[PDB]
Point group: C3
Chain length 140, copies 3
């Protein structure tokens, strides 16, 4: 049989963090009491480009950080920082203009303690994409 259904398009997405206990040499302007180096990221499978449909990723860190809303406007959509505690990060994915989409919000608990990593391989499902954005989606 055949039926008309609502159009939807999927995009695999990888996000989370890696973490590292610092040995002896710390980054320059790093607070003295910080114990770990960590990296929060949003990327594609096989580290393929995702910037064709993602314009910008913003990470909201714990308020103890200076300028805690960190906007990354070009790939790699990641941020490496120092710390001493585990906390929630708000990951905001901003799609390219022609998508006419709201910010994709989601959460990640930063893991430092048992290199440690906390990583997720999920799917972004776009409901009812417009013709322009569909083209961009299909460009790969």
């Amino acid at each position: 049989g055949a039926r008309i259904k609502t159009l939807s398009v999927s995009r695999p997405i990888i996000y989370g963090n890696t973490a590292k206990k610092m040995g002896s040499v710390k980054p320059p302007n790093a607070p003295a009491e910080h114990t770990h180096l960590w990296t929060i990221f949003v990327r594609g499978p096989q580290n393929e480009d995702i910037s064709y449909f993602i314009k910008k990723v913003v990470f909201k860190l714990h308020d103890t950080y200076p300028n805690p809303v960190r906007s990354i406007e070009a790939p790699p959509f990641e941020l490496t920082e120092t710390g001493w505690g585990e906390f929630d990060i708000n990951i905001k994915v901003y799609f390219v203009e022609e998508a006419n989409e709201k910010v994709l919000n989601f959460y990640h608990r930063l893991r430092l303690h048992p290199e440690v990593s906390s990583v997720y391989f999920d799917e972004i499902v776009f409901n009812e994409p417009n013709e322009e954005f569909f083209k961009i989606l299909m460009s790969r």
Copy 2:
């Protein structure tokens, strides 16, 4: 995890109509009471070919139109006409013979009043396609 599931393949489809209110100069042969120019269509995104899986499209017009069953047997799957009233069109989609499919029947309210367009970007889901039609679908 892995599971056996019924096979399903989707094809994006764009259908609907554009309309324009004519001025004092009307096309030759146009009935005097007719106020609008309009086009009913079924197409692919980015106007990509759809005849590889769609053999013909039939637009069933209001019975006040002469020969109201309009069969379009080659792309573009569209017709242009004059009119005064908004009315339902039964769109009949005939898939290529390999599909072994019944006719896909759907409907579209012709819109003339707030160019005016009523256009849908949906998905045709094919349930349990046969091996031969699957190949055609996969060829694109």
Copy 3:
């Protein structure tokens, strides 16, 4: 709209059996009272390679057969035998080790009587595939 969802990936699969009445000329070491030739198989659409994700296919036959656990380790993932009766065959599909998947079991009723064929065109859905397995899946 956009939502984060669990990743899943589909691969179409074709499986089942063909059968033929032997009639007059028999195989070399086939049991004398066997009446039919039959082939049990797992394959891809258009007979395309599936060994890129499937490592091994095992056909468990009726225990009236010698060594009824039959392991096919390379494509074509098929087995040709003789017989005189219809019985349940357990098809065990072993995915490539990067999948880190359990065996996928399915049932086939071997059909001999109304060439006779019992063939299915379904879909293997992989839930939460790991990145390395996803890469192999995307190879196509």
